[PDB]
Ligand binder design. Structure first.
Ligand SMILES: O=C(O)C1=C[C@@H](OP(=O)(O)O)[C@@H](O)[C@H](O)C1
Ligand SMILES: O=C(O)C[NH2+]CP(=O)(O)O
Length: 426
């Protein structure tokens, strides 16, 4: 399957964003654990959220979904999830299901196997397993240490644990969400650097919404009290996805017009709102509201930036760079290599097909645009963001053909229709 995007002369309009994947999967898990019934509004319907919903169903969590799957009423368990069955749960390639559930299912005495798609068995989890085992959990890595599939037999108590923060923030996120329900207090020491720090902020905001605080000592040590229970907030509004927003804001920066996204704004908890600052640095004009961000085209110039704070939206800069004057350098993005695909390899390979010169560094990418873009069929590596990032090539005089366009469904099933709504073809 393939989708050819014809050249787009102008983009403009307003996009009502689908829900945030990151917020959706945290909110579902916390609602499942909490005391009380939580009503989630603007929940994302996408593969990663569906895998979480299916796992929660299999684990006995009671919830209802609206017809469009964006409103979800969760009856909280008031405690750790429990199953009497020797289940195997398939989690696709959803890190925000696999990592949080691997920790949560270490509470108690279940016997559950977590698995997923082939790529998920190549995505690291050992830093999380190590910390959970230090806290008393029984875990078997059925194929190889540091990777799924995992057999979880429970037993997490708490105590003094160390977690490496240098590969994924999700390991720390998973520990933080599980530790409050453990029988003992947990002190989490971060071994070295912490990547993707804004996602830790999301986790802490969500936990606070659900009635639980922790002592964050400069992102280097966390003190969590055990014996707690999450408390439903009642209604909870899931923010629009700021990573999904990046494509539309960039499209405005490149080929607007003014493109406005709604459902996020200056006070959002998602770190990817900071992507708009990069477009501003490149020369676009950005306007902020409490519930919108808008971007208007101006002449674009390349940037050289550390992107560790926005690793997902950073991919959008890599293709927006094709429209900027000069060489763009994106630094401190090593964990691109351990995500839906090796994104440093994939982005460099596909950028070259449209004519860019690319230096693929170990943990950075340097992109020098060609004078004129070339027509290419873009491989997407079963990676939603490869498809969405390369859609921007069509904001030029050259079409682009996106292979396997349905991979956008990991986070954004209707991406191409939403892009078309704001596009005027040349
Ligand atoms: O916690 C989260 O919601 C996420 C954390 C990030 O992963 P890393 O911490 O591995 O960079 C990000 O890439 C992912 O899409 C969502
Ligand atoms: O969404 C992204 O760009 C990266 N997702 C990684 P996951 O959410 O599967 O851990």
């Amino acid at each position: 399957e393939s989708l050819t995007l014809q050249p787009i002369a102008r983009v403009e309009g307003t996009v009502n964003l689908p829900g945030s994947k990151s917020v959706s999967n945290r909110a579902l898990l916390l609602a499942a654990l909490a005391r009380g019934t939580t009503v989630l509004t603007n929940l994302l319907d996408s593969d990663d959220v569906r895998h979480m919903l299916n796992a929660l169903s299999a684990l006995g969590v009671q919830y209802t979904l609206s017809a469009d799957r964006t409103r979800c009423e969760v009856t909280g368990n008031g405690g750790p999830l429990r199953s009497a069955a020797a289940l195997e749960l398939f989690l696709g390639n959803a890190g925000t299901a696999m990592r949080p559930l691997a920790a949560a299912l270490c509470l108690g005495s279940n016997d559950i196997v977590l698995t997923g798609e082939p790529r998920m068995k190549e995505r690291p989890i050992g830093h999380l397993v190590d910390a959970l085992r230090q806290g008393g959990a029984q875990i078997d890595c059925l194929e190889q240490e540091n990777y799924p599939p995992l057999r979880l037999r429970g037993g997490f108590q708490g105590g003094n644990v160390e977690v490496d923060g240098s590969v994924s923030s999700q390991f720390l996120t998973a520990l933080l969400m599980t530790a409050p329900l453990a029988p003992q207090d947990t002190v989490i020491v971060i071994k070295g650097d912490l990547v993707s720090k804004p996602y830790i902020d999301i986790t802490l905001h969500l936990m606070k919404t659900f009635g639980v605080e922790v002592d964050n000592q400069s992102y280097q040590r966390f003190v969590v009290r055990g014996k707690q229970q999450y408390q439903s907030p009642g209604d909870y509004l899931v923010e629009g996805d700021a990573s999904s927003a990046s494509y539309f804001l960039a499209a405005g920066a490149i080929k607007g017009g003014t493109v406005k996204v709604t459902g996020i704004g200056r006070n959002s908890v998602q770190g990817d709102i900071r992507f708009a600052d990069v477009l501003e640095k490149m020369g676009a004009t950005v306007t902020w509201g409490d519930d919108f961000i808008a971007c208007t085209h101006g002449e674009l110039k390349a940037v050289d930036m550390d992107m560790n704070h926005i690793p997902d939206a950073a991919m959008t800069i890599a293709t927006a760079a094709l429209f900027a004057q000069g060489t763009t350098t994106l630094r401190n993005i090593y964990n691109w290599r351990v995500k839906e695909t090796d994104r440093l390899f994939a982005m460099a390979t596909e950028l070259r097909k449209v004519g860019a010169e690319v230096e693929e560094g170990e943990d950075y990418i340097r992109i020098t645009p060609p004078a004129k873009l070339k027509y290419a069929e873009i491989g997407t590596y079963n990676d939603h963001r490869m498809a969405m990032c390369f859609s921007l090539v069509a904001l030029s005089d050259t079409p682009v053909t996106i292979l396997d366009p349905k991979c956008t469904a990991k986070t954004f099933p209707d991406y191409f229709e939403q892009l078309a709504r704001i596009s005027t073809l040349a």
